[PDB]
Amino acid sequence: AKLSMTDRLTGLLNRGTWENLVDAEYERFRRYGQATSLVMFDIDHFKPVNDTYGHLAGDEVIRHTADVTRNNIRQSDSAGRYGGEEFGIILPETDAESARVICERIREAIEKSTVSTSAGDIQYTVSMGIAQLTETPENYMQWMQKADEALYKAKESGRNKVVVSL
Numbered sequence: 305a306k307l308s309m310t311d312r313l314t315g316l317l318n319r320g321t322w323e324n325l326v327d328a329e330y331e332r333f334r335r336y337g338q339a340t341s342l343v344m345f346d347i348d349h350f351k352p353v354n355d356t357y358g359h360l361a362g363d364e365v366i367r368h369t370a371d372v373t374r375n376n377i378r379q380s381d382s383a384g385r386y387g388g389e390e391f392g393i394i395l396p397e398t399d400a401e402s403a404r405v406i407c408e409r410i411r412e413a414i415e416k417s418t419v420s421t422s423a424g425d426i427q428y429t430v431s432m433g434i435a436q437l438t439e440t441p442e443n444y445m446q447w448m449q450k451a452d453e454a455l456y457k458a459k460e461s462g463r464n465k466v467v468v469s470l
């Protein structure tokens with residue numbers, strides 16, 4: 305019964321469990337210094353999508369996003385549903401430049417997608433933020449903060465894009 309750890313709608317890890325994994329990777333880094341990156345991404349114009357096509361359509365968009373993610377990342381990477389339309393991925397042994405590759409592959413897969421819903425045929429995009437862990441963040445939440453900041457820049461910078469935290 306691994307139901308305590310997963311999000312019902314997407315099947316991905318839930319926020320609580322995913323964060324525990326982020327914290328575990330953070331401490332592993334503090335000890336060993338391996339390249340490791342974090343991704344935080346959101347579905348673009350979600351509210352508008354939800355308002356326009358209905359919440360059921362929105363759920364399908366969320367489920368498809370999770371499916372694209374699940375089928376596009378390594379079993380050693382860890383994806384989680386952080387919030388309503390927000391997702392996160394832990395990418396161990398992966399530096400910033402390498403993270404951009406998997407992120408772009410996901411971005412493109414989503415961009416080329418068509419969510420066949422009962423309300424209509426939808427096309428959407430995602431904004432993504434990447435933050436490779438450095439010695440600066442003093443706890444895992446400050447690491448998450450850097451990725452979230454990169455995500456905001458991606459959204460404000462045009463959306464349907466990947467931004468790496470500098």
Ligand SMILES: Nc1nc2c(ncn2[C@@H]2O[C@@H]3COP(=O)(O)O[C@H]4[C@@H](O)[C@H](n5cnc6c(=O)[nH]c(N)nc65)O[C@@H]4COP(=O)(O)O[C@H]3[C@H]2O)c(=O)[nH]1
Pocket residue numbers: 375376377378379380409
């Ligand atoms: N373009 C690209 N896509 C990536 C990359 N890493 C992961 N993916 C995608 O995400 C899935 C990851 O599978 P996995 O759990 O690592 O499990 C993988 C993997 O562990 C193993 N495998 C396949 N090719 C390689 C490889 O070139 N090197 C290693 N070490 N293992 C491989 O077999 C499974 C095959 O999975 P897939 O059907 O290919 O499905 C793959 C793959 O299409 C990547 O570096 N580049």
Ligand SMILES: Nc1nc2c(ncn2[C@@H]2O[C@@H]3COP(=O)(O)O[C@H]4[C@@H](O)[C@H](n5cnc6c(=O)[nH]c(N)nc65)O[C@@H]4COP(=O)(O)O[C@H]3[C@H]2O)c(=O)[nH]1
Pocket residue numbers: 376377378381395396397398401402403405406
């Ligand atoms: N954590 C994580 N990192 C990722 C992922 N996708 C890409 N990267 C990083 O970014 C580089 C992407 O290389 P690529 O152009 O996809 O070119 C890749 C890829 O196309 C192929 N390859 C490796 N593994 C797989 C695989 O599992 N499935 C498939 N289909 N191809 C693979 O060989 C090349 C191996 O590249 P790398 O030396 O591993 O270096 C990789 C990898 O370390 C991912 O899903 N998760």
